[PDB]
Nucleic acid binder design. Structure first.
Lengths: 92, 165
RNA sequence: AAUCAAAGUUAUUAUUAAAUAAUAUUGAUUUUGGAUGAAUUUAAUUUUUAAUUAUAUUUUUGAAUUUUAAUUUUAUUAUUUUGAUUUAAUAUUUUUAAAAUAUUAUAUAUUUUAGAUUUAAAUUUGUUGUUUUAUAUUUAGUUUAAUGUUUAUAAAUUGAUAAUUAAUUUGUUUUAUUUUAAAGUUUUUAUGAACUGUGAUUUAUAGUUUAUUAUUUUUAGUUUAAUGUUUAAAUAUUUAACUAGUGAUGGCACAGUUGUUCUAUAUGUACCUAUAAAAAAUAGUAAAAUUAUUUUAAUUAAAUUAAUAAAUAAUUAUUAAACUAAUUUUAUAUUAAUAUUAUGAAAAAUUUAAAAAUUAAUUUUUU
RNA sequence: CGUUUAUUAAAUGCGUCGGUCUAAGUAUUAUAUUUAAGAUUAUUCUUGUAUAUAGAUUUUUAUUUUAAUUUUAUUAGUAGCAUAGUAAUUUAUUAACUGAUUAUUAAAGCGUUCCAUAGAAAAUUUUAAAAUUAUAACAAUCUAAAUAAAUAAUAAAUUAAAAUAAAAAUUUUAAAAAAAUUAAAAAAUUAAAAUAGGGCAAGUCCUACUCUCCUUUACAAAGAGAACGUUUAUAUGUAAUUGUAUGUUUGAUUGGGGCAAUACUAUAUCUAUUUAUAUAGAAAAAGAACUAUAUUUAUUGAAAUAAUAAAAGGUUCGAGCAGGUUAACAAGCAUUAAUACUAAAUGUGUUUCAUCGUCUACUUAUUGCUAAAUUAUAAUUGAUUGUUCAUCAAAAAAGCAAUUCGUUAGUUGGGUUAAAAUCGUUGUAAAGCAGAUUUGUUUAUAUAUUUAAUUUUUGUAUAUAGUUAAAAAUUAAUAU
């Protein structure tokens, strides 16, 4: 077709496309959930050297859990999201 | 220089004065984003039992009942949409009000008369201009917070300052 | 000056056409070779002269589709011996060839003159009979099934497993059709080098200027002009020009996505777009048409969108519907289901625009 | 010095030169080209193809190809030279849009340039038979009738004329209002034409190159103890013949809103996370990314190819637009076989001061209209040209400069069929007739606009009028 890049209303800026403006807040509870979130201007600019974090309803667990930011493209439950075993302070 | 799109029709989807269900858009207002900026003031602000949709400024009723427009007494440019829930309460009067005025026995000074409302308010509240024109001193607008702890004033509302009548 | 409306019958002669029918078939229209053969050779694992009972699957997501039907069992390639049967069609030639009304200074056939006039079809995108077709006579001239009677029974659902208190018809299984005429094209192979290219092909039948065998040039077939313009000619008459070819009108030789080219996209048999042959290409997206009088319910619309109109609303249409307060004891076309190749509204009232009309507008819009 | 389908600075051809070739032909040779011979010379500089190259690409310029935008030196230069122009000067002509000369910054000629140059095409001078203007001037051959009997075209006509208004159009109708047969000539109208000329739509064609894509025969890799043919892989070449190269308003725009009478052509203005649906991939729970004229179907961009076939519809107009002393005017869009401007011939209705009024011929260029020469110099509108030419404008025949990556595009010059038996109207004549012009209709027919000499030159004033006459422009005009 050609015309791969459109020219009517090329928008000045565009929030969704900016080095890390749209971020998948995947859950720290490694349930594989994610909630795509565009960092507002409060974090659009590098106000945060730290990787964004939020508390969001984890619909799988039905519990409010952490949401660590992460690139929106990628498998969300890799062999890196395995937590090292631990014996809880319960049990005999 | 350029082109332009056609202005959509933002008009009533019911007949004012007649009964109304909730799944009816009472009026599909111009969210007057002057040109897709983020500040507008709708023509018909929401009224009794009417709740405005935030996005498209369309008023949907919340309970089934007869609908009406209340033009503000101060400025006849700013209107509310009242839905009064009882449909029999108005039908069983209209069927009288229109049966009385047929026999010539109804009075035309009714509140609901369109051309009388200008005078109606003034028969009852003769200085209502001064009750809305009065400018409040910043002292009384923030009544002594201690009167709230001592309980004299039931609850301080500091932002509700404007008389919308 | 001048009109005047009107002749329907030849006369005479007899065994084809078309489909069909499931028996034959080494190439139809003289006598090969006629030295003795070498000269009369068409054969190969592919929808082929071999022609196949489903709607589910599966699939570049969108033209791709169903498997033995009874194993040699009959769906199988067909005529003389009823003018061979049947049904449809019907002529073709010979020689026929006809007829007695309306003025008297002038619009158009009616007798009694005056009244009377779009010729039609299309096209009118109401730039509203918009410059298109028709000489006439006759023949030939265009395919969507207007119907449901007894054996007899259907009807949904998840993404998927499954679930189906979920509520209900009809049908001895209904399929097939889809306009008509018309391109340039386009691909598939057969014919052509007698025209004309180029290859090759002729080794001295007239005149002449110059010392010269080179060279001026007699020059009646040819760079011009007149005539001709369906012409005597799909190129001729008269005429200007030019003319010196031991290097060329010419033995046979090259052929079509290609030959040849002293090259002009020129010619290769009288338009090179080669001919010839075989298709149903597309043509609704302003082409031309689309055959049957006397009838028996009306109207327009104008919005979402378009690498700009086959699609949607709205209208119109076919078929069908039920009577929610409002009034008279008035008056009311509202709908459903399907069918639908459409973007622009006289005179006003105004509104954009140099408009110099277009544009918005919205009531017209004749059987 | 030959040779050609629109016939020539077309293409040939000898020489020189560049490149190639020593296992098929002779390397002072034959292939493969670019130029053009003869005579002078043949300049400056490089970004890419080619060569050479080293796994390849990427790099990389002895010679060659193509290039030089301020290459521009030689050289000619208003020239087939993008406009500017009729270049400014000089001649030449009575008049110089001619042509030639000088020089010379030529929109961007240029070394294959320039000179030399013959019969060609121009420009002079000059002479001259074609019947060249003036100018008109039949000797010749080309009957009727009698006979044979074709063609284009054909809706009809009893109206066709004529005048006027129109309304969409050129007018043709409609309407009003007006009033003449058969025969032959003429071409004003009907369609006197053919067929060219446009531009638009959908369709197909054909050619071209850095960007699209196969069947592709080349290059490279690999495999065969590599005896050579094949198969692959990676590559994709305009050598490749596929398809795209738009749509809308005229050249920019394509989005979703809003203000402008809750009209909106794009009208006029602006805004902005107002968001780009599906399908394969990407994310596997409820959550998610990418991109397309942002309704979103296709796989590049360009050409005139003499482009075409089936259609309608305009350049030259009952109305528009931009560049002439500022402003009145040439004239790129709403009709429609009207089928180019000019000339020739031949008309016409207007309108324009005091009689009263409208005949100039030439030069250059055939563009058109002026400039300007003849003492003195053509009123302005309008309808006009199928009868006549073609000069212009003009359809791969070229070429120059110019734009193009190319195919090609636009200025300039040389080329380049322009045409049918006249049926209706129309009009000129005629109908053989006449012892006779004429009552009224109606009129192709009308004395002057290339100036003299008289005579009054006096009246008036610094020069001098006015009726007329002669001569000149030389010809006569009646249907019953």
């Amino acid at each position: 077709r050609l015309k791969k890049r459109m020219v009517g209303f090329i928008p000045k800026v565009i929030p969704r496309k900016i080095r890390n403006n749209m971020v998948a807040l995947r859950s720290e509870a490694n349930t594989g959930h994610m909630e795509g979130y565009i960092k507002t201007e409060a974090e659009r600019l590098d106000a945060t050297g730290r990787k964004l974090q939020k508390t969001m309803w984890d619909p799988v667990l039905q519990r409010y859990t952490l949401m660590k930011e992460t690139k929106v493209r990628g498998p969300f439950l890799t062999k890196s999201n395995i937590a090292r075993k631990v014996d809880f302070p319960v049990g005999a | 220089q350029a082109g332009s799109p056609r202005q959509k029709a933002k008009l009533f989807h019911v007949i004012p004065g007649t009964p109304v269900t909730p799944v009816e858009k009472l009026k599909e207002q111009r969210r007057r984003f002057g040109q897709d900026r983020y500040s507008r003031q709708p023509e018909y602000r929401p009224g009794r039992n009417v709740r405005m949709d935030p996005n498209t400024f369309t008023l949907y009723a919340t309970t089934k009942g007869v609908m009406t427009i209340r033009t503000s007494r101060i400025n006849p440019s700013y209107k509310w949409l009242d839905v009064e829930p009882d449909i029999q309460k108005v039908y069983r009067s209209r069927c009288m009000r229109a049966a009385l005025q047929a026999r010539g026995k109804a009075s035309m000074m009714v509140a609901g008369n369109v051309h009388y409302r200008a005078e109606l308010d003034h028969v009852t509240e003769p200085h209502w201009r001064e009750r809305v024109m009065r400018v409040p001193k910043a002292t009384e607008r923030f009544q002594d917070p201690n009167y709230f702890t001592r309980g004299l004033v039931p609850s301080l509302r500091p932002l509700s300052r404007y008389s919308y009548e």
